[PDB]
Amino acid sequence: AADIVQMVEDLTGKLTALAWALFLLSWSIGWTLRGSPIPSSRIKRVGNSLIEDSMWAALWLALGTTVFAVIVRLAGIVNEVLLG
Amino acid sequence: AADIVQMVEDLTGKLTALAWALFLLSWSIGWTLRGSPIPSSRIKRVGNSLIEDSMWAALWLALGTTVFAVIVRLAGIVNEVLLG
Amino acid sequence: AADIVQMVEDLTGKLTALAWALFLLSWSIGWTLRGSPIPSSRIKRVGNSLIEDSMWAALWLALGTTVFAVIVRLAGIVNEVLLG
Ligand SMILES: CC(C)CCC[C@@H](C)CCC[C@H](C)CCC[C@@H](C)CCC[C@@H](C)CCOC[C@@H](COP(=O)(O)O)OC[C@@H](C)CCC[C@H](C)CCC[C@H](C)CCC[C@@H](C)CCCC(C)C
Ligand SMILES: CC(C)CCC[C@@H](C)CCC[C@H](C)CCC[C@@H](C)CCC[C@@H](C)CCOC[C@@H](COP(=O)(O)O)OC[C@@H](C)CCC[C@H](C)CCC[C@H](C)CCC[C@@H](C)CCCC(C)C
Ligand SMILES: CC(C)CCC[C@@H](C)CCC[C@H](C)CCC[C@H](C)CCC[C@@H](C)CO[C@@H](COCC[C@H](C)CCC[C@@H](C)CCC[C@@H](C)CCC[C@@H](C)CCCC(C)C)COP(=O)(O)O
Ligand SMILES: CC(C)CCC[C@@H](C)CCC[C@H](C)CCC[C@H](C)CCC[C@@H](C)CO[C@@H](COCC[C@H](C)CCC[C@@H](C)CCC[C@@H](C)CCC[C@@H](C)CCCC(C)C)COP(=O)(O)O
Ligand SMILES: CC(C)CCC[C@@H](C)CCC[C@H](C)CCC[C@H](C)CCC[C@@H](C)CO[C@@H](COCC[C@H](C)CCC[C@@H](C)CCC[C@@H](C)CCC[C@@H](C)CCCC(C)C)COP(=O)(O)O
Ligand SMILES: CC(C)CCC[C@@H](C)CCC[C@H](C)CCC[C@H](C)CCC[C@@H](C)CO[C@@H](COCC[C@H](C)CCC[C@@H](C)CCC[C@@H](C)CCC[C@@H](C)CCCC(C)C)COP(=O)(O)O
C-alpha cells in the first residue's frame, strides 16, 4: 500500500542522481567535440545540440519537481471556480 | 451496502497516491533520456512523449475529480430543461 | 545504485583530462597554420577558427562544472517564488 510508493520514490531518487552525473558527462562530451582539431561543421553542430539539451534538461528536472505542485494548485483553482 | 463504497474509495485513494509517484518517475525518466549523451532522435521523441503524457495526466486526474460533479450538474440542467 | 554513478564520474574525469590535452593540441595546430610560409587566406581563417574555439571551450568546461550548481540554485529560487 505504502511500501510500493516508498520503493517508487527510492527508484526516482537513484535515477535523479544518475541523471545529474549523465548531464555533466554530456556537457563534457559536447565541449570536447567543439574544441577538437577536427574542422568539420556537423560535429560542431552535434556538440552544440548536446550542450544545449544538457542545460535544458538540467534546468527542467527540479523545475518539474515543482511543476507537479503547480498543476495541483491549478486543479484546485479550476475546481473552486467551476463549483463555487 | 456502504462498506463496499468505503473500500472502493480507499482503493481509489491508494491508487491516486501511487499515480502521483509514477507520474514524477515518468517525468524524471523522460528528462533523463532527453539529456543523455546518445545523439539518437527516436529516444528524444520517446522522452518528449513521456514528459508530455505525464503532465497531461497529472493535470487531468484532479480535474476529473471535478468533472464528475460537472457532469452531474449538466444532467440536472438537461432534466430541468426537458421536463419544465 | 551508486557504483554506476561512480563509474560515470570516472569516465567524465578521464574525458576531461583527454580534453585538456586535445585543446592544447588544437591551439598548437592553429598557431602553426597561422605562421607557416603558405600565403593563402583560407588556411589563416581555419587557424583562427581553431584557436578561437580552443580558447572558448577551454574556458567553458570548468565554467559548466559551476553552471550546473548555478542552475540548481535557480531552480530552488523559482520553486520558492511560485510556492511561497
Ligand atoms: C518500470 C515500471 C513499470 C515500474 C517501476 C517501479 C516498480 C519498482 C514498482 C512496480 C509497480 C507495480 C508493477 C504496479 C503496482 C501494483 C498496483 C496493482 C497497486 C494497486 C493499488 C494497491 C496499492 C491497492 C492495495 O490493495 C488493496 C488490498 C488491501 O491491502 P492492505 O490493506 O494494504 O494490506 O485489498 C486486498 C485485495 C483482496 C483486494 C482485491 C481488489 C483488487 C486488488 C483490485 C485491483 C486494483 C487495480 C484494479 C489495479 C490497477 C492498477 C494499474 C492500472 C497500475 C499499474 C501501473 C504499472 C504501469 C506500473
Ligand atoms: C555512452 C553512454 C550511453 C554510457 C556512458 C557511461 C557508461 C559507462 C554507464 C552505462 C549506463 C547504463 C547504460 C544506464 C544505467 C542503468 C539504468 C537502468 C539505471 C536505473 C536506476 C537504477 C540505479 C535503479 C536500481 O534498481 C533498483 C533495484 C535494487 O537495486 P539495489 O538496491 O541497489 O541492490 O531493484 C531491483 C529490481 C528487481 C527492481 C525492478 C524495477 C526496474 C529496475 C525499473 C527500471 C528502471 C528504469 C525504468 C530504467 C530507465 C533508465 C533509463 C531511461 C536511463 C538510461 C540512460 C542511458 C542513455 C545511458
Ligand atoms: C565528417 C567527420 C566525421 C570526418 C572525421 C575524419 C577524422 C576522424 C579523421 C582524422 C584526421 C583526418 C586525417 C583529417 C584529414 C583532413 C583532410 C585535409 C580533409 C579536409 C576536409 C575538407 C572537406 C575541407 O573542408 C573543410 C576545410 O578545412 C580544411 C582543413 C585544413 C585547412 C587542412 C590544413 C591545410 C594544410 C596545411 C594541411 C597540410 C597537409 C598535411 C601536411 C597535413 C596532414 C593531413 C591529414 C593527414 C591531417 C589533417 C589534420 C587537420 C586538422 C588539418 C571545411 O569544410 P566545410 O566546413 O564542411 O565546408
Ligand atoms: C537507436 C538507439 C537506441 C541506439 C543506441 C546505441 C547505444 C545504446 C550504444 C552506446 C554508445 C554507442 C557506442 C554509440 C556509437 C555512436 C556511433 C558513432 C554511431 C553514430 C550514429 C549515426 C547514425 C550518426 O547519426 C547521428 C549523427 O551523430 C553522429 C555521432 C557523433 C557526431 C560522433 C562523434 C564524432 C567523432 C569525433 C567520434 C570519434 C570516434 C571515437 C573516437 C569515439 C567513440 C566511438 C563510440 C564507441 C562512442 C560514441 C559516443 C557518441 C555519444 C559520440 C544522427 O542521426 P539521425 O538524427 O537519425 O539523422
Ligand atoms: C499536454 C498539455 C495538456 C500540458 C498542459 C500543462 C499545463 C496545464 C500546466 C500549467 C503550466 C505548466 C507549469 C507549464 C510548464 C512548462 C514546462 C517548462 C514544460 C515544457 C514542455 C516541454 C515538452 C517543451 O516542449 C515545448 C518547448 O517549449 C518550451 C517551453 C518554454 C520555452 C519554457 C520557457 C523557458 C524558460 C525561460 C522558463 C523559465 C523557468 C521558470 C522560471 C518559469 C516557470 C516554469 C513553469 C512553472 C511555468 C511554465 C510557463 C510556460 C508558458 C513558459 C514544445 O514541445 P513540442 O511542441 O511538443 O515539440
Ligand atoms: C589553398 C591551399 C591549400 C593551397 C596549398 C598549396 C601548397 C600545399 C603547395 C606547397 C607550395 C606551393 C609550391 C606554393 C606555390 C605558390 C604559387 C606561386 C601560387 C601563388 C598563389 C596565387 C593564388 C597568388 O595568391 C596569393 C598571392 O601570393 C603570391 C605568392 C608569392 C608572392 C610568390 C612569390 C613571388 C616570386 C618571387 C616567386 C618566385 C617564383 C619561384 C622562383 C619560387 C618558387 C615557386 C613555388 C614552387 C614555391 C612558392 C613558395 C611561396 C611561399 C612563395 C594571395 O591570394 P588571395 O589571398 O587568395 O587573394
Numbering used by the authors:
A (entry chain B), B (entry chain A), C (entry chain K): 2 to 85
Question: What wording appears in the published article?
Answer:
Here, we determine atomic structures by cryo-electron microscopy of three conjugative pili, two from hyperthermophilic archaea (Aeropyrum pernix and Pyrobaculum calidifontis) and one encoded by the Ti plasmid of the bacterium Agrobacterium tumefaciens, and show that the archaeal pili are homologous to bacterial mating pili. With structures for four bacterial conjugation pili (pED208, F, pKpQIL, and pTiC58 from A. tumefaciens) and two archaeal ones (A. pernix and P. calidifontis), it is clear that there is a common architecture for all and obvious homology, despite negligible sequence similarity. Each prokaryotic pilin subunit consists of two or three hydrophobic α-helices, with kinks appearing in some of the helices, such as in A. pernix and A. tumefaciens. Hence, pore diameters of all prokaryotic conjugative pili are sufficiently wide for the passage of ssDNA, but not dsDNA.
Here, using cryo-electron microscopy (cryo-EM), we show that a protein from the hyperthermophilic archaeon Aeropyrum pernix, a homolog of CedA1, forms a pilus which is structurally homologous to bacterial conjugative pili. The reconstruction of this pilus to 3.3 Å resolution allowed us to determine the pilin identity directly from the cryo-EM map. While in the A. pernix filament the helical rise and twist per subunit were 3.6 Å and 76.5°, respectively, in the P. calidifontis filament these parameters were 5.0 Å and 74.2°. In A. pernix, there are two lipids in every ASU, one of which adopts a partially folded conformation, with one of the isoprenoid chains folding back on itself, while the other has a crescent-like shape. Instead, an unusual C25, C25-diether with a phospho-dihexose head group was the main lipid species observed by mass spectrometry of a cellular membrane preparation of A. pernix, consistent with the previous identification of this lipid in A. pernix. Both non-protein densities in the A. pernix map could be fit with this lipid, suggesting that the same lipid is present in two different conformations. The contacts with helix α1 are mediated by leucine-rich hydrophobic interactions and one charged interaction between the phosphate head group and the positively charged Lys15. In total, each CedA1 subunit will make contacts with 10 lipid molecules. In A. pernix each pilin is bound to two diether lipids with phosphorylated dihexose (i.e., glucose-inositol) head groups. One of these lipids faces the lumen of the central channel where it might also provide a similar negative charge to facilitate DNA transfer.
